[PDB]
């Protein structure tokens, strides 16, 4: 809101035009556009790397497992969703070697606990594809051991370093308030993310 100029925002939207895929059929076009605008706050260096790797951010109008490429996850219990009685059929956002996201489910509490669905999922793709699983490196493990319970959801974020990475990334990039909150709660994580983007 003062840290990225109009030219850089437009460049990031242009990069995202070669990443984001809108679904076939009816969907909420305004909310899909809002998701793209939130994604455009991610540092352009990461967006450029996603584009070069041909990573697509698939926006969906239905359940993830109703897509042919995720049908294999029907009935599978996601990591961290044990005991919920729920499976991938119920999950609104996926990230890793692909990214798939239900339009309308961005906000925290819409079937998931992330501060923002699309930034959290895209962070997983950046971790895995762009940064070669940096969340599982020794350096990040040590930061996670200290700070990984300081964003809440201790049995998920505090247990899986890749989840703490993805959520911290989402705080860093969503808006000025979540960025400030991360700096206060998780100062080593904040510095780690700042240095990754240098």
């Amino acid at each position: 809101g003062s840290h990225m100029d109009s030219t850089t925002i437009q460049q990031n939207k242009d990069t995202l035009s070669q990443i984001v895929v809108f679904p076939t059929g009816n969907y909420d076009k305004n909310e899909a556009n809002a998701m793209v605008n939130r994604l455009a706050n991610i540092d352009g260096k990461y967006l450029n790397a996603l584009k070069q790797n041909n990573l697509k951010i698939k926006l969906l109008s239905g359940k993830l497992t109703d897509e042919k490429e995720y049908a294999y996850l029907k009935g599978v219990v996601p990591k961290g969703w044990e005991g919920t009685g729920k499976t991938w059929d119920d999950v609104p956002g996926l990230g890793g070697s692909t990214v798939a996201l239900r339009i309308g489910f961005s906000n925290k509490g819409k079937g998931h606990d992330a501060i923002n669905l699309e930034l959290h999922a895209t962070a997983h793709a950046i971790d895995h594809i762009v940064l070669n699983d940096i969340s599982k490196s020794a350096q990040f493990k040590q930061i996670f051991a200290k700070e990984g319970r300081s964003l809440g959801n201790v049995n998920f974020l505090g247990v899986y370093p890749e989840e703490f990475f993805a959520e911290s990334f989402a705080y860093y990039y969503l808006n000025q308030d979540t960025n400030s909150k991360l700096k206060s709660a998780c100062p080593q994580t904040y510095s780690f993310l700042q240095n990754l983007a240098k």
Binding site: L73, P78, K79, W81, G93, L94, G96, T98, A121, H124
Partner: peptide, 4 residues
């Protein structure tokens, strides 16, 4: 790789 997949993650919720």
């Amino acid at each position: 790789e997949v993650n919720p």
